Design a protein around this ligand. Structure first.
Ligand SMILES: *[C@@H]1O[C@H](CO)[C@@H](O)[C@H](O)[C@H]1NC(C)=O
Ligand SMILES: *[C@@H]1O[C@H](CO)[C@@H](O)[C@H](O)[C@H]1NC(C)=O
Lengths: 237, 22, 22, 237
């Protein structure tokens, strides 16, 4: 017996690992093409995310990838200083299709499972076997689990990147991984596993309007600008 | 790593279940 | 370790074959 | 389609790992309850054994065990200085039954899969969950492979521990993992992945007879003793 509510949900999980010959490494879990919610540099996990203990299968998958990259750098690609890989896993029922993306300093490679199409761009050296990744059998084996353990997180994150859940002051702050943009009529961009903040400051210049757009499809403006730093939700347009 | 050992623990369970469900 | 990566290589083949043989 | 010649062969593979808190470690592969043919301290592999490349699945199984033991010592058993584990895997067709044996300085534990019987002897501390081992799904998953890749090795090792393949001089040398014993009417015992040698020397004492017994079931004597170190095969009794 399986769950219908979790089988209906369709989302993409994005596992990405970066490794530098110098020593640097970074491995992250993202949801619905958003910003990362789980970050390793114990991981930095978001408040609306599942416990570290309940993310173990995804944890090892990422560690296997660090090792596989450290190994590519250890055996070949000696001029290349920074290799990187991204697995874009789409869940549509109990089946996963993971597209693999690789990036060295001199080459970019993409592969997609059904089309089997390998797109290679760059002067650099890469293997078409390496282009297709590994360890996908771990996500493909743990569909029911990963889906059920992430179903609350993946839709509560969407219900947070909503118009009535963003805070404009022009400093725009939405406590959701869903990416937004701010337009003025200097830009300080940042992040955190829990909050995303973009600030647009004018050096004495009169703007009178501040636009805000979301990747889930919405637009808003906050007018008139006040002398104080007062909090307000975006106003529809 | 107790993390990998948890993955192996769970994998033996998936193997023991997959064989029993044939 | 290229040894573990060979084990994972072979395991994806066992997974891809076991699913295709149902 | 499977192999009939490899399905018929019934043998026991014995995987054993030793780890000391001080740093020491030793992981070995044995066949038909004999001496070790593969030893890690690149492994020391026997001449009649399969290539390191074709033993990879058994290689990782052993490494998982080193880690699991290093972990038991890292989280508990602080008075205990040396933990050890042995998996006695019996192959009867395409099914494996692996009995697990553990040994700390203060406790001995045995477990057997069907009877599920856990035998614990000692004053020491152990977990009945730990007693049952892990990673057996690797040998149970790779039956056809392990069997086909080891079928020549497991029977050519038996056909070497034969009467007409031992060399008595009293120094007895049989180039086979099958264990033997030497009886005189000082004893220097040793080993190597390729040869087993037992020497029995007398300080001017007259023996006139030297007995040799094998674990496959045979007995022999070499008489009369010569003044020179001449090589001869055991003579039946
Ligand atoms: C935002 O709007 C939704 C309806 O679209 C409502 O259910 C939710 O409670 C609102 N949240 C806040 C914090 O205003
Ligand atoms: C040993 O005896 C067997 C028969 O039991 C024979 O086939 C084999 O060739 C002999 N080997 C040697 C080295 O004498």
């Amino acid at each position: 017996i399986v769950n219908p509510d979790d089988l209906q949900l369709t989302f993409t999980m994005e596992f990405e690992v970066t490794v530098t010959r110098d020593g640097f490494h970074k491995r992250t879990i993202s949801v619905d093409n958003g910003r990362p919610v789980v970050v390793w540099d114990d991981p930095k996990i978001c408040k609306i995310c599942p416990a570290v203990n309940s993310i173990n299968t995804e944890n090892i998958f990422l560690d296997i990838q660090k090792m596989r990259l450290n190994n590519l750098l250890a055996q070949g690609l000696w001029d290349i200083q920074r290799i990187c890989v991204r697995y874009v896993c789409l869940f549509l029922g109990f089946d996963v299709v993971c597209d693999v993306y690789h990036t060295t300093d001199r080459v970019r490679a993409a592969y997609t499972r059904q089309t089997g199409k390998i797109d290679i761009q760059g002067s650099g050296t890469f293997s078409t076997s390496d282009a297709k990744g590994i360890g996908t059998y771990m996500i493909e084996s743990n569909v029911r689990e990963i889906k059920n353990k992430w179903r609350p997180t993946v839709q509560k994150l969407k219900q947070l990147g909503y118009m009535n859940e963003t805070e404009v002051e022009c400093v725009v702050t939405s406590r959701s991984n869903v990416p937004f943009t701010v337009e003025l009529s200097i830009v300080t961009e940042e992040s955190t596993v829990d909050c995303q903040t973009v600030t647009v400051k004018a050096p004495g210049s009169h703007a009178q309007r501040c636009y805000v757009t979301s990747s889930l499809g919405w637009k808003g403006v906050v007018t008139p600008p006040s002398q104080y730093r007062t909090k307000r939700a975006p106003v529809n347009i | 790593s107790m993390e990998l050992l948890e993955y192996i623990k769970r994998e033996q369970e998936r193997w023991d279940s997959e064989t029993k469900s044939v």
